[model samples]
Target: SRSYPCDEKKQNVIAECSNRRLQEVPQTVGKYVTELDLSDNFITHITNESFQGLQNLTKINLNHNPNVGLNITDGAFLNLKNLRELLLEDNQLPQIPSGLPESLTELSLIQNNIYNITKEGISRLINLKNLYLAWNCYFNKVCEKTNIEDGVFETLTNLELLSLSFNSLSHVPPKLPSSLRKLFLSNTQIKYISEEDFKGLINLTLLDLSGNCPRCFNAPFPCVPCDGGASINIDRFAFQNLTQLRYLNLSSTSLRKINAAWFKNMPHLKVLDLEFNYLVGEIASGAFLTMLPRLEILDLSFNYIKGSYPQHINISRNFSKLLSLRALHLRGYVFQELREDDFQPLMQLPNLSTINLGINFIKQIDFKLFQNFSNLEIIYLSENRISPEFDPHSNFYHFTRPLIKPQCAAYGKALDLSLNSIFFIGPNQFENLPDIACLNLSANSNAQVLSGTEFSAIPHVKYLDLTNNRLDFDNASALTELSDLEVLDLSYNSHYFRIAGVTHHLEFIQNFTNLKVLNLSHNNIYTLTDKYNLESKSLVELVFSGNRLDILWNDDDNRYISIFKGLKNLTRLDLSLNRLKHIPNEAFLNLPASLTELHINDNMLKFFNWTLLQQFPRLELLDLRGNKLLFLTDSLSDFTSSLRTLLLSHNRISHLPSGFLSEVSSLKHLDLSSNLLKTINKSALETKTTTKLSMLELHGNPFECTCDIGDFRRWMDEHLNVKIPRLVDVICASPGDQRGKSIVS
Candidate 1:
């Protein structure tokens, strides 16, 4: 087990030899490796015995060692004295990389060509905290640099995240660091910005200036479009010493106007992302959202304003003084509708909850134009083409025109009319909003929810998403009057087998005995029941995947399936793409002892019998991934404890039997990844004994490095990631002259 090159000798004591094509640093490696990943390598040079003794080095990833780059030399990392995170990203270095290690604390030279950022060793990195110098010369545009000279943050006083993205920096780099708190200057060339470009950061909180002055008319890519008058003049105390600024990303900056002194005294500004801008003139007079008094979240998404504003543009004068405003992103404004005082000055903002107004094409959605709201939680109006003009044989269309009626405090919110084209669902047409409890009407199309008159007026609807609709819910009694329905997403309708079908037409599942979670996946259902029984006593979680159940585990003595014996509080069960081959035990003891998560992943299972999981006396996550299993039969401590995650990934397991995880000693995450495991003897690793394992995933197993794999490569070099997690995906195929190697290297 002490032999070298076994790929760094059973790697990972925190060593993940990235894209190993490594040209150096390959001698006996393991000097108690404490993290060294020669990232995407070619590694040209780094002498000084390339991390020689590896004194428990702390994190070092020479990111994507580009072509013929990386030339270190001078004391080469002077014996990494407790190095703390250092990644030379996409190295094409022409500078900066001389020794380096003032006990560093996270330094990533992203996409480098290193164009002058010298305070050489960056002023002695006094324990820096994340300093990812972004895209130097924008990925090797030779020396189109950006320098950060003068006292480079006077010893970066414990820097807290500073990323200079796409640098060619025309401005803003004048001595920053007042214990900075996250500042990533996006797409730099910094058109312009004043207030001494954030003078002395008052502990700044997220300030990402997105894509400098972009808006290149009708342009897709290939920029050169900066000047459009005050492209990014940005004056007005540019962020007045960032008074604890809270997230401000001026996305796609090509702003037309609107700069009310960039929010005057910056009173702890809270999230204000001006999404993809062309923010016309005074941005329809929303006076730079004035003095942002604790502005909550205001993203003007997809802005493409041309001019004279009025395209339903009226953020009602300064968006009603943001008075602690909460969530309001005017999505993709091609707004031809949603008029009548466009969100009516946000109805006196008391804490405006949510109103994204999704993809606006709103031909008509006059729900009294969002009737007075006190705490409206959501109203996205997704991909608008909102259909229903009524007339289900218009006898006054059931005399119901009332869309939202639970008295405007709009109770339990959420109403994202998913990618709409809503072809009439007349009946009560969403009567008595009662207390809007989410109704996402996913991808609408072929509709006609007659007789059950489409949800007989939302009887306290609770989470319903009719996903990918084409509608044919052959009257699940129009959803049995909802009765506090809890989560139901008739997934992908593609003619849900000509109207409702998940075990003999769902029988409205005993009128939603307060149903909890159900998403009939890919609706091509067939045989989950064959008769009936799913009564649902407050069911908990389900996703009858893709369909075709391969006919009840091929009748292993009548396959047991007592049709889910009325799922009483059943917990998570997704029969993933059911091609299920078997698992009998009276069809697994008819499920619910609060069935703890069991997803038969892409099935055709060839193995079984972990004492039939003691009939799931509290099964805890047992996902049989893409199967053809080959062998399993273990779990025999007479089954009692809660099984903890045993996802058998891509199978063909190859008869493993030693201590078969010793009666599942409370199995803790054991994924036999892409299995066919050639030889893992050592008592099949019941983890040194009876298995109280944490993690243990033999990734894409195919091992086979003879001599009993040196007792499982010395337990993969004595439990890496504390009991095998990644261990660099254990490779080394066979003795076919040591095929593909790396059983440890």
Candidate 2:
């Protein structure tokens, strides 16, 4: 128990007094407090009197403060000689606060209005280890490339990490400290770099230059390179002494050529990401990789590496020298035909385990490529538009059989062939990879006709995603081999599949009795007892959202009841967006009382049905949002003690009956925002109040600032006791003269 306006913990090690409508630092806080937080307050100025006696304070958070703006008098923080970390994020300071303690080691000024970077405010700190000056021009266009002066960071000898992202620095700041290990300069105005720029940062390991390309001409983002459309310039020895560099990302930089001389000195480099470079004809013949002999992971995705044939690409033979390279990314390259020899160069890297060829729009793939170096573990081939080659009735099937057949012997790998034009799978078209764990063929535009071998080929797959690809099914017996699978997703079947004469029916998943998760939402499912039988003793989560189920529940004679009764271990059920106007009492019968969560949002239901919840003994979360709910009838306080959260936002809710909250002793969060709420009666919050509720969302409604709201506005004065997000956004929109002002104000 303390008499100050703060919370003390760990005896005297810390005290938090944030959001207390504090106009200034609390002088009454104990002198032994080492950490104090005064964030998100109305404090506009800092003076020497702010921390006169708190010499033991090692850190202080003043984030999102100076509600309108902030000003710091010189020497305001000179008294706290022991302070080491100071956070002033999201503040509106025109310049860095002066007189910060020299003992500080970490200082964060992110999202401040400090447009210029100079040695004035931070040159004295010899112990600084981490310094952040990113997003300093937030919400203002006053920052320019000329504002960041040269040699600004040269004095930070002890700094290990420095970030200047999202700024307008014209070029690399010269003479960076030698002790830096990581430096971030993403999304800046740097168009070129000289050899002298990175000479001293020999100890650097990670460097980022994303979105700093010189040819950002006509690009979607705001930053642009030099006026005339020339590619970024890199001096021959720009990276002269960067021998210790490990990971470097220059993605989204319009780099047209890979100058081998630029990286000739960086031998220790391991990971380099140059995705989105849009590199075309200038792709060097693999010799560039010889410079980075130790490089392991390289991302060159989204580059148009045009060869002799349009849309035909080749892997550089120099890739053979990258003995340590393990992953190569060339996704988003168009390939009319994928030859097995195109990857012959990558076979030399013994440690390589991943090759990403996704989004290539490939119509035909050499299946032998899957066997050659298919010993790799992770492969992504999605968005390739590949399709069936040999229908049984095709005239050329006899001639194609003589070719050396492709084999799949990889033990355990994850492959993605999603977003393709795959329509048919002839028998034995692809062989078995027995231990293959994940196979994703989702989002195919064409109607898929999977002969039973589609999944039987890889019978041991544990997780398979086929959403948005309406596969032909007959009682799903075609998937009889997948009884050992855990997650089988068949959701989001479009109406276009029905126009194709695809008859929708219950998947009859009694086959996969071992399935633990099944998503069949928006599939136009009808619970006809004759066609529906899902008895899964192992199922834990089920989804049927976005379907018309209330009709079957009403006229189908309790058919939906047994559909859920079989899930004895079911814990989570999502029935949202079902347009359910009402639920008959029998619809919820036999539901596993062990169910812990239920979602029924985005419906047309009218009233709160407490009796429906009486069946689930352990229901904790009820997603009742986006409905026509107008009121809640309270159950006994003991019955709903297991209920912890209620999502009641975005509905026609106007009133909260008294015991609606008091009854749920375990309720911790109640979202009452964006509803028809106008006023909350005083009596409702008086008796047996919700002591367990930690969050109350009451914004986004027409709040009249009449005298009757005085109680709620005053109770909100003690807002630290109850956390409300966007509480300052809770402004009154009506009541004649009392309008357009925050109720808390």
Highest lDDT among the candidates is held by which one? 2
lDDT of 2 by residue, 1-745 (tens): 2225666668627877787677887778897789888898888888998888778989999997977587789889878888889998877888887888888899998877777777787677778999988776422367645376566777889999988877777688876789999988876767787888788888989888876763343344455654465556678888888888898877767777777786777878898888767564534474577777798888887775444234467677777788888888887666678877777877657778778787777877776566666357777777787887222122110122311111221224677777887766656645734256667767875355443466677778777777887665534555667657777777876444334254544545666667888887886655332454456778899998876666556655655655577777889999887778877666665667878998889988886667667677798988888888887774446457678888888888777676455555788888888887777776556547646777778878778788878877665665455666654456687776766565665
Clashing pairs in 2: none
In candidate 1 the C-alpha lDDT for residue 59 amounts to: 84
Write candidate 1's Cα lDDT for 316-429 as tens digits: 477777778888777666656565466677777888877876776666655655657667677777786777722212211013232333432243777778778876677546
Q: What is the TM-score of each candidate against the true structure?
A: 0.37, 0.78
Error of 1 at 335 (Å): 17
lDDT of each prediction vs. the true structure? 0.70, 0.72
Model 1, residue 253: displacement in angstroms? 15
Tell me the lDDT of model 2 at 499.
Answer: 45
lDDT of 1: 0.70
